[PDB]
């Protein structure tokens, strides 16, 4: 049949239709091709198609041979063996000529036939199939998993014409396979109603078919084992298991620990650069974000300024990278990436140059994009002694900052640092188009608002803190504020406020 | 550059073809023919 689902296979409707259109169209057509090969990853049904094609055509029973079985120690027996194998159709061709049936030969694991002895055996088969006497009643189907280890000569035209392929099933194919292998369960009512096949099809990814069957078998096994007690002497529910109903829990368990996939996946870490969100502890944050939005719209709309850059400056422990990430996510450009020194530990200068070049090469392809670079001074490692740093990465940056992208494309660049004077000394402060400033907490009112937003000290403690602080100014970074709060939250309720004030005084300084 | 140290080899033999019994069979058959001719 041409249904492709009656015989117990799914996921390759188009390939089956191609097989029908290309291979056997001539035979069906009112009154040829003599080479077929199959190759695909392990799993997805190949032997099934072999057996089905064996019983499909109104042809004689196919012969099944092995891969490494055509051999023998005594020179002479292998040649006689192949001769015996191929002797079947000779008599039929002799006695019936053109008006003869079709012969199907199945070679299993043919990859072991091509590699001295292997040369002669491949030559014998090669001559027999495509030699002086052309037989139009012989068809050979071979299958492998590693086509790389096959000879080119075996694949020339006139010998192996049709070269199909198999592939990992899609969601529809997985649903078809699950239907096929749960048909019996549904027919005998042994499957519970709470199970939802759509959820399983959505959840499972790239199981290549065989793993789906394994998962179904594992779920059956666990549902079967729930109704058996073994220790002293094996015993089973007997009658009570006659109503054994599988549950969603079994398909859950069989998926999370066993029946794992044979392939991998990827991971993302974009959540690591914001851990406490953003709180409006003061006016300047809104100003910074509004300026970022203006820059984003400027890069989006302009036509004769394709490249735009900005610099974020602020004393240490002032959350510059957090604002950089937030402004990056606000724009919602198609392509966004963050180049940070955390990945590159122990690298030389050349590796850093290559990494930056790769990131920018990726960024150039898309239409419009934005890139952010954080902690420049650590990227081109800097030490006040000497000073000392790298002169290759610096030039790479100074060149990449004023290189226009391909025609009709847009790139935005943001940079964050905490040492502006040094950058102005190296002359890199000229490249950037404009700069923005990130301040520190200055007035006690902003501090009190910050504590109120954090919600860690109550009205009495807050009043005491206000009395002790309103007559003073402050200079503190938000990250350090969180650290100090955590440090002072470790004492008993009696010493918390006094400890916090003591720590603030100890770290208390002026700009 | 890196020059390969050299190499080492492994072997795998194959069955021999004595084909010496057929000679004895042929000699015996010729004797058969001689005796058969004499008997007539």
């Amino acid at each position: 049949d041409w249904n492709f689902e009656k015989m117990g296979i799914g996921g390759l409707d188009k390939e089956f239709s191609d097989i029908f259109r290309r291979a056997f169209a001539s035979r069906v057509f009112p009154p040829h091709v003599k080479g077929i090969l199959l190759y695909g990853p392990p799993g997805c049904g190949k032997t099934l198609l072999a057996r089905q094609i064996g019983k499909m055509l109104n042809a004689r029973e196919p012969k099944v041979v092995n891969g490494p079985e055509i051999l023998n120690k005594y020179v002479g027996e292998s040649e006689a063996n192949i001769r015996k194998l191929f002797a079947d159709a000779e008599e039929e061709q002799r006695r019936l000529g053109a008006n003869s049936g079709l012969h199907i030969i199945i070679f299993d694991e043919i990859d072991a036939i091509c590699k001295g002895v292997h040369d002669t055996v491949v030559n014998q088969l090669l001559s027999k199939i495509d030699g002086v006497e052309q037989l139009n009643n012989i068809l050979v189907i071979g299958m492998t998993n590693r086509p790389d280890l096959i000879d080119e000569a075996l694949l020339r035209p006139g010998r192996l014409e049709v070269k199909m392929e198999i592939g990992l099933p899609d969601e529809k194919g997985r649903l078809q396979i699950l239907h096929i292998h749960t048909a019996r369960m549904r027919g005998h009512q042994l499957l519970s109603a709470d199970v939802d096949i759509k959820e399983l099809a959505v959840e499972t990814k790239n199981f290549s078919g065989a793993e789906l069957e394994g998962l179904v078998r594992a779920a059956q096994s666990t549902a079967m084992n729930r109704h058996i007690k073994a220790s002293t002497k094996v015993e089973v529910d007997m009658e009570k298991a006659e109503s054994l109903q599988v549950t969603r829990g079994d398909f859950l368990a069989s998926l999370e620990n066993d029946i794992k996939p044979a392939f991998g996946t990827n991971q993302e870490d974009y959540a690591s650069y914001i851990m406490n969100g953003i709180i409006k502890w003061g006016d300047p944050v809104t100003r910074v974000l509004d300026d970022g939005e203006l820059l984003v719209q400027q890069t989006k709309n302009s036509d004769r300024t394709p490249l735009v850059s900005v610099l974020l400056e602020g004393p240490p422990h002032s959350g510059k990278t957090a604002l950089a990430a937030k402004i990056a996510e606000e724009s919602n450009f198609p392509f966004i990436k963050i180049c940070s020194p955390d990945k590159m530990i122990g690298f030389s200068e050349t590796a850093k140059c290559q990494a930056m070049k790769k990131i920018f090469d990726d960024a150039y392809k898309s239409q419009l994009s934005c890139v952010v670079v954080d902690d420049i001074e650590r990227l081109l490692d800097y030490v006040p002694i000497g000073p000392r740093f790298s002169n290759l990465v610096l030039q790479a940056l100074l060149v990449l900052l004023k290189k226009a992208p391909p025609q009709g494309r847009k790139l935005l660049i943001i940079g964050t640092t905490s040492r502006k004077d040094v950058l102005q000394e190296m002359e890199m402060l000229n490249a950037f188009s404009t700069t923005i400033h990130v301040p520190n907490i200055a007035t006690g009112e902003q501090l009190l608002e910050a504590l109120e937003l954090l919600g860690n000290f109550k009205d009495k403690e807050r009043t005491t803190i206000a009395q002790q602080v309103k007559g003073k100014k402050v200079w503190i970074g938000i990250k350090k504020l969180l650290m100090l709060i955590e440090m002072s939250l470790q004492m008993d309720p009696e010493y918390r406020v006094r400890k916090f004030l003591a720590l603030l005084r100890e770290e208390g300084a002026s700009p | 550059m890196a020059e390969d140290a050299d190499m080492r080899n492994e072997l795998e033999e194959m069955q021999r073809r004595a084909d010496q019994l057929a000679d004895e069979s042929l000699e015996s058959t010729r004797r058969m023919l001689q005796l058969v001719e004499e008997s007539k």
Binding site: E77 | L21, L35
Partner: peptide, 27 residues
């Protein structure tokens, strides 16, 4: 295989038996 060699040996044993038979006939 060694099966072929054994088959040849049995062939030749039968030939020797025929040799003895024909020698007896001539005698």
């Amino acid at each position: 295989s060694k099966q072929a060699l054994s088959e040849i040996e049995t062939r030749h044993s039968e030939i020797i038996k025929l040799e003895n038979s024909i020698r007896e006939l001539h005698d």
